[PDB]
Amino acid sequence: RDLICAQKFKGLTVLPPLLTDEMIAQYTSALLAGTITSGWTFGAGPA
């Protein structure tokens, strides 16, 4: 038995994050797309 389920049986339950790994990776793709194509204007107004 893994330690995750072992610690859960004593009240130590881990809450899942709001932003998943897929949603965080999509935020990084928007930053890269804005940095390569727009430069520094996508953070100080329109792209």
């Binding site: 339950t13 809450l15 899942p16």
Partner: peptide, 29 residues
């Protein structure tokens, strides 16, 4: 999950750490 007493009185219940079997119904992560 309460949208506010001034708005309505309907509430949703989220049982953290269950698979909708050992408790609309929608199983989340």
């Amino acid at each position: 999950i309460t949208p506010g007493t001034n708005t309505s009185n309907q509430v949703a219940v989220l049982y953290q750490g269950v698979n909708c079997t050992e408790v609309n119904v929608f199983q989340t992560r």
